[PDB]
């Protein structure tokens, strides 16, 4: 199984220094997750910078739109749907790049809130299936 891991999407950083701090924390999380995948025998690949930046632009816009929701619950559902569609698109892109293999995807999302970085890893459906 080839797992394509996207560059982290850092959202709402107040300064370039905070964004770099969030990028490093999210990259460390992605690195630890990728090493865990390789222990399971999975090949881990990366996207090109243009695809990563298109993913960043789209998911940041989707998250910005979701802040208009009236409740946390509706916000959660909007962002979860956006993440699911972004994961599906990364799988499709990676499948076209590696058509001889089964492909899965991993998305990392980070935020800076009250001076701290919170980062989270999201696995595509095929990856979750493979990890069973």
């Amino acid at each position: 199984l080839i797992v394509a891991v996207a560059s982290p999407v850092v959202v709402a950083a107040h300064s370039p220094e905070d964004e770099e701090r969030a990028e490093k924390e999210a990259e460390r999380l992605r690195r630890r997750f990728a090493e865990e995948l390789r222990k399971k025998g999975f090949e881990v690949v990366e996207l090109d910078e243009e695809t990563d930046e298109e993913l960043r632009r789209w998911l940041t816009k989707a998250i910005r739109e979701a802040t208009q929701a009236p409740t946390q619950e509706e916000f959660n559902q909007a962002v979860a749907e956006a993440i699911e569609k972004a994961l599906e698109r990364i799988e499709e892109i990676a499948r076209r790049r590696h058509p001889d293999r089964e492909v899965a995807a991993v998305l990392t999302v980070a935020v800076v809130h009250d001076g701290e970085v919170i980062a989270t890893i999201f696995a595509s459906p095929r990856l979750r299936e493979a990890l069973k």
Partner: peptide, 30 residues
């Protein structure tokens, strides 16, 4: 909607912690 200032970051932070807890995603924080 998010009318305040830290509303957007607080909403997203809550989601990330919610995803880790209620859906088994993997989270890290400083």
């Amino acid at each position: 909607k998010c009318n305040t200032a830290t509303c957007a970051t607080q909403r997203l932070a809550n989601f990330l912690v919610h995803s880790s807890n209620n859906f088994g995603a993997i989270l890290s924080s400083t």
